[PDB]
Design a protein around this nucleic acid. Sequence first.
RNA 1: ACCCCUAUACCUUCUGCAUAAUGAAUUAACUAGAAAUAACUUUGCAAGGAGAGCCAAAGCUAAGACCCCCGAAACCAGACGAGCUACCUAAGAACAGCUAAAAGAGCACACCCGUCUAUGUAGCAAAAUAGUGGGAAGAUUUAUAGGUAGAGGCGACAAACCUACCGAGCCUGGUGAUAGCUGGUUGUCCAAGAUAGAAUCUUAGUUCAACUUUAAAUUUGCCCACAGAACCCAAAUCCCCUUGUAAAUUUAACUGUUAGUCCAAAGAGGAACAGCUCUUUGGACACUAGGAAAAAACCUUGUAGAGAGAGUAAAAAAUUUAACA
RNA 2: GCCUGUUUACCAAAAACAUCACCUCUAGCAUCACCAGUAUUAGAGGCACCGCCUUCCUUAAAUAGGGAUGGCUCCACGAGGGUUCAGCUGUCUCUUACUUUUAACCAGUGAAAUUGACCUGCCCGUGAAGAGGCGGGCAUAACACAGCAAGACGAGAAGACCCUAUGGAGCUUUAAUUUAUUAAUGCAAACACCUGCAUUAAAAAUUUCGGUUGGGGCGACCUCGGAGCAGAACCCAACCUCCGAGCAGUACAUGCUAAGACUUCACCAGUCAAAGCGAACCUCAAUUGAUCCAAUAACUUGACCAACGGAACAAGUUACCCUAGGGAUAACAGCGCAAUCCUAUUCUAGAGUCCAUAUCAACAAUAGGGUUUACGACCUCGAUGUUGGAUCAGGACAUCCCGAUGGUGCAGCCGCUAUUAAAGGUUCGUUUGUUCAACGAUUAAAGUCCUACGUGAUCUGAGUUCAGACCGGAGUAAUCCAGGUCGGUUUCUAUCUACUUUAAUUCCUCCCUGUACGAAAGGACAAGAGAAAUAAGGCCUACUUCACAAAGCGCCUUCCCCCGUAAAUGAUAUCAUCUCAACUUAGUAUUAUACCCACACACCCAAGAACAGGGUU
Lengths: 120, 338, 246, 109
Amino acid sequence: KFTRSRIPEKVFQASPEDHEKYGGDPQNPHKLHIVTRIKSTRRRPYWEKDIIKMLGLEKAHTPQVHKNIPSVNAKLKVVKHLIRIKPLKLPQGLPAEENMSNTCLKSTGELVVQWHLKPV
Amino acid sequence: YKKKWAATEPKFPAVRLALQNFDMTYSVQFGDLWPSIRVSLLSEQKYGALVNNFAAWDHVSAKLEQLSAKDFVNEAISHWENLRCFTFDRGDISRFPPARPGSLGVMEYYLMDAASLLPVLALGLQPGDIVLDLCAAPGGKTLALLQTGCCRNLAANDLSPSRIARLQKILHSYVPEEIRDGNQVRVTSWDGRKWGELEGDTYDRVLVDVPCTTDRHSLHEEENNIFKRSRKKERQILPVLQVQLLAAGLLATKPGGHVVYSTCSLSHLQNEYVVQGAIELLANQYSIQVQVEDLTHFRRVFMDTFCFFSSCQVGELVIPNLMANFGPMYFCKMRRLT
Amino acid sequence: RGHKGERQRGTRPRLGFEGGQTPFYIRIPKYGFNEGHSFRRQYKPLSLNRLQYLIDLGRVDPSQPIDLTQLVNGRGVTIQPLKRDYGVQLVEEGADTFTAKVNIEVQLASELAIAAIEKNGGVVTTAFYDPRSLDIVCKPVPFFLRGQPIPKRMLPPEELVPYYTDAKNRGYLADPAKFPEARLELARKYGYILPDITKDELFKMLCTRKDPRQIFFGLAPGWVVNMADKKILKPTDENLLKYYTS
Amino acid sequence: KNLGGKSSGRRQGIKKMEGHYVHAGNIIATQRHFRWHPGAHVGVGKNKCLYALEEGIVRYTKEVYVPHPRNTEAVDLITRLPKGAVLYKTFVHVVPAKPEGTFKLVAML
RNA sequence: ACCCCUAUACCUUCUGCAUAAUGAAUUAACUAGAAAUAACUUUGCAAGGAGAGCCAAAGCUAAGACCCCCGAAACCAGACGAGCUACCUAAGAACAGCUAAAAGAGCACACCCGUCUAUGUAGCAAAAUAGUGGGAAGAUUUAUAGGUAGAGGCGACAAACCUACCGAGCCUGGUGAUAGCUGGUUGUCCAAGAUAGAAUCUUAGUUCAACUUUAAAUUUGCCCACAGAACCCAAAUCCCCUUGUAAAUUUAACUGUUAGUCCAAAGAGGAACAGCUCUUUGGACACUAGGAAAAAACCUUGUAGAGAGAGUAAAAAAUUUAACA
RNA sequence: GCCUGUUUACCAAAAACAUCACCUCUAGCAUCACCAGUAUUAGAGGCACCGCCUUCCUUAAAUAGGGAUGGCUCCACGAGGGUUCAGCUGUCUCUUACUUUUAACCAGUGAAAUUGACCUGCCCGUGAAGAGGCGGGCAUAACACAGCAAGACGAGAAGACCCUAUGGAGCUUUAAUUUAUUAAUGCAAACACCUGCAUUAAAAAUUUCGGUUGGGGCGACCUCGGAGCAGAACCCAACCUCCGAGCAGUACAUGCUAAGACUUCACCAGUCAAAGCGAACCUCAAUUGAUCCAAUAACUUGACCAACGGAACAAGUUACCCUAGGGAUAACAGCGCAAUCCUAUUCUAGAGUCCAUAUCAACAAUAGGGUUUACGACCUCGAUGUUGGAUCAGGACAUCCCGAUGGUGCAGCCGCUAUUAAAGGUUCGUUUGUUCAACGAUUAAAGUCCUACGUGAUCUGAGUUCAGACCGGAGUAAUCCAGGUCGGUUUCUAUCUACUUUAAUUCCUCCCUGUACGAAAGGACAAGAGAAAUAAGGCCUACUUCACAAAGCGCCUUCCCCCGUAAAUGAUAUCAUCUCAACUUAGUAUUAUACCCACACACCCAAGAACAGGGUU
Ligand SMILES: Nc1nc2c(ncn2[C@@H]2O[C@H](COP(=O)(O)OP(=O)(O)OP(=O)(O)O)[C@@H](O)[C@H]2O)c(=O)[nH]1
Ligand SMILES: [Mg+2]
Ligand SMILES: [Mg+2]
Ligand SMILES: [Mg+2]
Ligand SMILES: [Mg+2]
Ligand SMILES: [Mg+2]
Ligand SMILES: [Mg+2]
Ligand SMILES: [Mg+2]
Ligand SMILES: [Mg+2]
Ligand SMILES: [Mg+2]
Ligand SMILES: [Mg+2]
Ligand SMILES: [Mg+2]
Ligand SMILES: [Mg+2]
Ligand SMILES: [Mg+2]
Ligand SMILES: [Mg+2]
Ligand SMILES: [Mg+2]
Ligand SMILES: [Mg+2]
Ligand SMILES: [Mg+2]
Ligand SMILES: [Mg+2]
Ligand SMILES: [Mg+2]
Ligand SMILES: [Mg+2]
Ligand SMILES: [Mg+2]
Ligand SMILES: [Mg+2]
Ligand SMILES: [Mg+2]
Ligand SMILES: [Mg+2]
Ligand SMILES: [Mg+2]
Ligand SMILES: [Mg+2]
Ligand SMILES: [Mg+2]
Ligand SMILES: [Mg+2]
Ligand SMILES: [Mg+2]
Ligand SMILES: [Mg+2]
Ligand SMILES: [Mg+2]
Ligand SMILES: [Mg+2]
Ligand SMILES: [Mg+2]
Ligand SMILES: [Mg+2]
Ligand SMILES: [Mg+2]
Ligand SMILES: [Mg+2]
Ligand SMILES: [Mg+2]
Ligand SMILES: [Mg+2]
C-alpha cells in the first residue's frame, strides 16, 4: 500500500562537504526559511495538500517566511519535494519601523531594508 | 446455465437409493439370506440395555430381569470355557423402558444395539489396559469400554466435533466425574489418520470403528444419508478412508497389542477387503506384520443371541434377523505380531 | 428530482417504509403508553404565583368568591373541555410568597396550596364539574345564548367520590364538621397559626359556597337567562321544580 | 465448499490510549483474550474488558506477572520456568486525578 | 470570401460516446414541479396569542417558501357484433363433354381449392398475377333468410375462426389504471458540491448510515514530540503537547449521491492472461489548460476577465554486435 | 398414412384431424335438444378399413436407396417424404441470338420510406476497442448523366435470439386459499318440493411461482462464531482458504437497583459495569428469531418464521405468447488475452546399422504469430439470424506447382531438407447442409491462412431458428429436448463515399539422346523445334447458334529481369579470405518500348443509354 513516508533522520544531518557546497555554518544557523512552492499539490496525497495549505504555500513561486524551528521543519520535511527552501539573509538586519515600507526580497534570499530602484 | 434439459434423472429419496444399492449388492453377496436380511433391516431394531456399572448396577439388573430381559453377556460367559447388557428372548419384540437417572445421579442404563457390544467384548480389555478409540464416537462402544476396566486411560478420538460433543454429553450423563477427571478419559477432535504419526506403539488395545454406510441408519434416516447423490464422492472414497484409519490404528497399537476393526455395514468391500488392504499396506509401506485372530469360538459362544454370517473369511459378521434384529455388525480382531 | 429511480419518478415508498426490512415503528412492541388517553382527566395548573399575579393586577377580584368562571373571565387560565380538561388544579408553586386572602374554588388542590391559602386567611374548596357543566362554567354567555335552562351539576364519578367527600381535600361534598380538624392539622404541620376567619369582616363572602348541584352562585338549575331583556324565567311546574332540585 | 466465515470484526482493542483522561466506569480496552491485564483502579468484566474504576489518567506499563495460586495452568507454566526467568505482562492503570473529597466548614457552632 | 493556424455537432444514457449507442428534416404554435409536518425569514401581540374550537414552561397569529409530463401489456362492468369466418336451421340453385355403369369411380370444362415455381413485396392486391396443380355427382360448391356472443360461441383440435391485428373479439366506462422500466422535464448569473457500509422476495429500487448543502450556537478541529498500544507465534497505523494554521463539534432543515473507471502499491482468484474479477492505501477521472501523435485514468498545472508583454512547469529515445594459431 | 375428404383465411395441406370397421364407458327413459327417438337405441371416448396369428446389390466413386391382446400384413389410393431405369431438355459444361416488358431520352402528371448539420476523399495509427470528420502522410478545379452495391456498423417493427421486472396473460397441477355455484346425501323446518345448517364430490374462481451462484447438469448456498487473506489502533470482499454452532453443564441472590462506558460501521439488537439495597462470608467462540397474534389470574411460553430483519396462508409450464427495458447480461460477430494451438531458434538426450546437427527428435529454455478450443463482458439487443454453396475476389507468405540456389544417407531418375521468390496458377465428380471428410478420375499443383470464421441493400435457403405433426426419452400434466424426420413469407426505387477500358503461364512430344551418369536396371540436363491447354486482347473468311449483323463451340496475336548464391584479385591478419574492405563477373529496373496525339442545321453510322464520336464529295 501507499502510505506516509518516514524519512530516516540521517538524511537531515548535514556533512562538512554539504556545508562547503551550500555556504551555511552549522553554528549560528539561519533563523528564518524562505519557502516557495515549485510543484503542484495535484496528484499528491491529501495530507501533502493539507500541509501545503497549513504552510500557506497555495500559490506557487510566492515566497513565504517561516520559523526555522523543529515543528515547521517537520512539516517542511513532509512536503519537502514540492518546495524550495532557502535561508532568509538580512544584510542590514531585520527592518525597523522606519523602513518597514521600503523592504524587498532579493531573488538571492536577501531582504534589503532599502529599495531605491536606482543604479548603484 | 442450461435451464431446459432433455431428461432429468428421477428424484429418489436417499432411503430408496440406499435400498437400490443394498439390493443390487447384498443380493449377490448373500444369495437366499438377502430377503431375511432386508426384512430385518426394514423392521424395527432390537435394543439391548447396558447397565451402567457406575450406577446401582445390581438394582438395575434386577429391574431388567423382572422386565424379563436376560444378560446375553452373562450367559455367553457361562459357556465361554466385565459388562452386563440385558436383551429379550429370541423373537420377542418388547422395548426396554426409557432409561432414567439413578439415585447416584447417573443414568441407570444405556439403550444400545446389542451387536455393537460384541466388538468391545472381543477386544478383551485386560485389567488396566491403555486403550484407544480411533473414530468410535457415537457412544455405545466407548461407554462399554469405560465401564470395562481400562483404568490405564482411554483416548477417544473423532473428526466430528458434533459427535465429540455427543460423546461428552453421554459421558457426563453416565460416567462419574470422579472417573472422568483424570487422564483416564481423553476426548479429542482430531483425525485418526494423523494418529499413527501423533502416537505410535502406544496403545495395548485399539478400537477402530471406521465411518461406513451404516446400512440400517441409511435405510431409515433420510437426513445426512451417505447414499444421497451429493455425497457420492464420500461414498466412493469411503474404502480408502477406512483403510487409512485401520492402518493408523495398527500403527498406534503396541507390538503384540490387539486392535478390533468394526463396521456397521454388510459390505464385503467395506469389511474384508478393508481389513486385508490395511494388513497389506501396513506390511509393505511400514513393514509391520499383523495376524488376524480367530473369532470362531466367539461366534459359537454368542450364536444363541446373534445370528452370524457363517460364510465369512476374516472377522465376524452379525447379520440382522427378524428373530434377533441386532445387526449389522462386522468386527475383526487383529494382533500386531511385530 | 435526481436521476431515474422511484425518487425521480415520484413514486418512492410510503413514510416509515424501510425497503422491506421490518420498519422501526413496527418492530417495537406495543405498550399501553396512550391507552385511555382520551378518557384521562386533565386539570389546568394554577400556581399560587399566577393567582397572586392576577390578584395584584386586578384581573381577579379577591373581594368576591373566586371560581372557574372568575378565573376564565380574568384570563388567568384557559380551559378546553373538549380536550378533556376537567377544571383547574391549585399548584403550590409560589406558596412561599402568597399573601392574598381569597375564597377560591377549584377542582383539585395540593396539600401545600391548601395550607398556603388557609394560612393567608382564605378558604379553598375542591369542587367537581362534569364536562358539560364545566363548559357552561368556562363560557357561560354562549350557553345563555343557546337558550336552554341551566342544567344540574352532575355528581362526581364513583372513582372521584372519595376525593370530593374527603375533608382533607376540602371536598365540596365532604362533611363540614371535619373541616376545622383538617385545617388545624395543616396549620400544625406547616407551622402557622390558624386565623379564625369567623372574626373577619369578609367572613360571609369567605363562607359562600354554591350548592353541589348548582353551577353559578346565584342561579338555580332550570332557570332560563333571557339576556336580550335582562330577565330570568323560573319554571313553576312541580315536576320541573322537582327534577331541577334533584 | 467453504461455508461461514462472514462474521464481522468485533471492533475490539484499546478505547483509551495512554494519557487520556478517563472517568469512572469508562471502558479502557476490550480484548478477546488477555492482551492487557488490569492494573491499579482497573476492573475486568466477564468478557475480559478493562474499565476504569476511578477517574484519572490511563498509563500502560510492564510488570512482573505473578498469577493467583489457584490458577493451576499458570502456576504449572511458572513451575516449569528456569530460576532466573520472570514473566512480564502489560498492565493498564488509572492514576486517580481528584482527591476522594475534602473537609469543608459546614457550621460554626 | 477562400487560401494560413486552432477546433472530435447537440441531447440523453453512461465508469467512459465524434462515436459506427438513443432522439432530432426543418419553421410556427402547444407541450411537462400541484402540498402537508416540522423548520427558517418577516410582521403583530406577548405569559399570553388567535374573530369561539386550538396552542402555550416565549409562545402564538399571519404571510412568504416546498414536491412534474408522456407511454404499457393488462383487470373488471355494461353494451355492440355470426352481411367475414366456424358450425347449424328453413327452403333453393349449379355441376359441359368422354369413359364406365348406379361408384364419397376414372379423364377433363364451368365451379371450388391453393401443391410447386416465377413475379410482386408501400404491390393490381393490407395475400394478388402467370404458369403448373388437387377435387370437380359429392363428407361437393353455392345464392337467400334465420341461430349460437366473449370467465362465451363454434371447431373433421390447426389453441382454427368469431368483420383485415383472438392463448381469448370490439366499443364505452372505472381510467389521468399501474409501471422500482424508457423517454422528456423550457429565462440569465454566481456560489458550495462526488461515492466507508448495513438491511431489504434485495442487489434496475428503497430506509438508515456515510458524503454533500444551507442557517445557527460555542470551542476547539487538523498537522502532530516524547511517552504509550501482545503474547501466541514490512510500508505503516492509532494516541499525541508544541508548532503552522482556521477550522471543528453541536443544533435545526433538507434533498441528492449510494450499477463507478484506470494508474502506483500490498494482496486474493484466474494461467505470477486479459482493457479479467474482488479487498485495502493513495492519485487522477467524471472539472480548466499544457505535454505523451490521436488520448476520461500517465506527467505538468490548477479559482476562473482583457492585453498584439514576460519567466517557467512537464515535454524530442537509444542503440549494430563473432577472423586467427 | 388404409382409402374419398379436413386443417393453421395471411409463411406449414402433411406422416396431423376426420374416416368406414373395431373396442371401452354411461343410460330402463317421453311433450323444446337427445327425440316427437327407446339397448340392433342414444350419448362420451379410443383407435383406425379389411385380412392374419397368438455383409450383399445398386454407382467409377454411395454419410443416399434397397436386402440379408398386441404385433404382422402396402390391395388400392397420395400435389406426402426418399431411391431409380429410359427419355427429355440451356439445370449445367458455357453461354449466345432475337421479341415484348422494363429500361434510357423527349412531353404531361407526379409519391414513399428516409433526412442533426454537412463545405460528405485514400492509407496507416488512435479511439466507447474496425473513422469522411481525431494524429501523421497521400490526394485534391467545378459541377452533371448512366451503372455498381464494398462502406455510411445503410432504411424499414423501441427487429429475431438471450436476460431482467416483487410486469402481464394462456395452460397443467398431489402450488396456496375457497366452495360463493351445481350434484348428492345427513340433520333441522314443514308436514316429495321449498328454506337453513353441515359433509362429500364435480366444477370452477383468486393469486403466486424467493434470492446468489453452476453452460456438458441430476446441484450448492442464504443466519451466527474462530483463523489467514487483513503481519502493527479499528475497519475491511470473495461465485477465496480452512474450521465450527444451532447445545450442554452448574446454580437457584443465575435477586433488585444504578453512575459511566463499549457496540459489528445505520437502526433494531447486542455487551461490560463502579456505587447502593438485599444476600452469602454461572462457563466459552457462536449455541440463536423482531412485531403482530395466540395461550395465561399473573408470571410467563409459543415458528428448523433456517429464504434465519422473519409476506399469516400460493407450485410447475409457455416455442401460442404479450408488455416495459437491458449491450448493466448471454449466443454469431468485433475487440483484449495467449492457457490451449502453430511456427522458428538454443541445448544437444536419443534415433539415423557407426554419425548430435542428410533427416528426425526427448526434457527443457528463448522468441514470434493471433489461423483452433477457451477465458473476458468493452461497442452494438430504438429490424444486421447463422452455417454451407453461387459470384467476385483483395491481401500475407509460414511456397502446393512453376523459377534460382546450398546440403544430402545427392552416381542418374526419383526424392528429403534448407535459403530466395507471392508474377502466374492451384480440377472435375459420388454420398452428405455440410464446411471438412471418405471414395473415383486427374493435375505441374490440386498450399496454409486473413479479409465482420471476406462478400446474403448481389443470390440461395439445403442444416440450424417461431408457429404444425411424428419416433425416442423426461414429466402427474401442461409441456420439454444440444437427439432423428416432414414442412415452413429472405423487403428495399442508391441520398453520400468508393469504383465502372491499367511485355502470359504451364503441360506434353520430338531433338540433344536410350547421350551424361550407371555394372546393369534405368535415365538426365541446358539449348532448339512442334503441338496443345488455360489467361488477356481482338475478329467473322470459313464451321456452328444464325443471318444485311451479334456470338462460340470457330479463328488470330501474345514480347524483359529480379539476386539465394558460385567465383577472380586482395588487406585488416604480408599465408589464406567472394569484400556490412577497397574491388572484378555471373548482374540485370532507370520494364524496353508499344498505344494516344489536328484547340472552333439536318441525315446516316460498324459510335452510342443521354451526351459525346465518325461520315455526308
Ligand atoms: N411468536 C410466535 N408467534 C407465532 C408462532 N407460531 C405462530 N405464531 C403466530 O401466528 C403466525 C403464523 O401463523 P400460522 O403459520 O398459521 O401458524 P401455525 O401455528 O403454523 O398454524 P395455525 O395455528 O393454524 O395458525 C405468526 O406470524 C404469529 O403471529 C411462534 O412459534 N411464535
Ligand atoms: Mg431521464
Ligand atoms: Mg472472518
Ligand atoms: Mg450516432
Ligand atoms: Mg439503449
Ligand atoms: Mg432518427
Ligand atoms: Mg351467415
Ligand atoms: Mg359431369
Ligand atoms: Mg370422383
Ligand atoms: Mg369444417
Ligand atoms: Mg394438436
Ligand atoms: Mg400448439
Ligand atoms: Mg379482427
Ligand atoms: Mg403513469
Ligand atoms: Mg464552484
Ligand atoms: Mg422479507
Ligand atoms: Mg391420407
Ligand atoms: Mg386427398
Ligand atoms: Mg397458412
Ligand atoms: Mg382453407
Ligand atoms: Mg401452403
Ligand atoms: Mg442424389
Ligand atoms: Mg419526364
Ligand atoms: Mg481504422
Ligand atoms: Mg450516381
Ligand atoms: Mg458517421
Ligand atoms: Mg427493445
Ligand atoms: Mg454503532
Ligand atoms: Mg434476509
Ligand atoms: Mg410445436
Ligand atoms: Mg466489469
Ligand atoms: Mg519465404
Ligand atoms: Mg476469428
Ligand atoms: Mg430449411
Ligand atoms: Mg432437431
Ligand atoms: Mg427439413
Ligand atoms: Mg410441400
Ligand atoms: Mg434479396
Ligand atoms: Mg438496386
